[PDB]
């Protein structure tokens, strides 16, 4: 048996059905800054700057920006500890991450909520709550007569 660099990447590194050929150029048109959070997804058509198969499907933080690639910090679990790994990835294997979009939209929503609450004199709720049990309510059967169901007898269908 073998332990080469791209062992077991038959499907992960492959391009999807009817997804071959030309690479969209918005990938190259994107810009990245140090501290940005990016998702790593290996493009099989770009053999330069390929990250190892472990980092495929991982999310990290950009720590270095270069001509055609970014340095990403990932944390890899080995034995009983976490190791900080730094990988140089070409842009084609890097996608900006929505892993923080909810928080980044909540921070500004909370800012406007705070200023509006201060203006209006009544505090509002800034922190999200988990789904709560449903409240009491009344269901009218007017024009919604219940339909009585019974278990069906067994019969063969072949």
């Amino acid at each position: 048996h073998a332990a080469g660099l791209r062992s077991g990447t038959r499907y992960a590194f492959s391009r999807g059905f009817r997804k071959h050929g030309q690479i969209p150029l918005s990938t190259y048109l994107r810009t990245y800054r140090v501290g940005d959070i990016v998702d790593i997804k290996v493009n099989g058509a770009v053999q330069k700057g390929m990250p190892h198969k472990f980092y495929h499907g991982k999310t990290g933080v950009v720590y270095n920006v270069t001509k055609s690639a970014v340095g990403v910090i990932v944390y890899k679990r080995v034995k009983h500890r976490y190791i900080e790994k730094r990988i140089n990835v070409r842009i084609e294997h890097v996608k900006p991450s929505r892993s923080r979009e909810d928080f980044l939209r909540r921070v500004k929503e909370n800012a406007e909520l705070k200023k509006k609450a201060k203006a209006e004199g009544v505090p509002v709720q800034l922190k999200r709550q988990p789904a709560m049990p449903r409240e009491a309510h009344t269901v009218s059967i007017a024009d919604n007569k219940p339909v009585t169901l019974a278990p069906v007898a067994y019969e063969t269908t072949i």
């Binding site: 709550q129 988990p130 789904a131 709560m132 049990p133």
Partner: protein
Amino acid sequence: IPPKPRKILQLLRLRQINNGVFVKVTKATAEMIKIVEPWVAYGYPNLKSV
């Protein structure tokens, strides 16, 4: 006991048999209780019980 139910029971503070706790029903707590269902009996207390 498997480690995930063990951790959930530790977080619910049910570390010993015949231990009991009050829990406010939310989605977050209900999912944990559902996971540790094979180890707990739970229900809706009345004023006398409380």
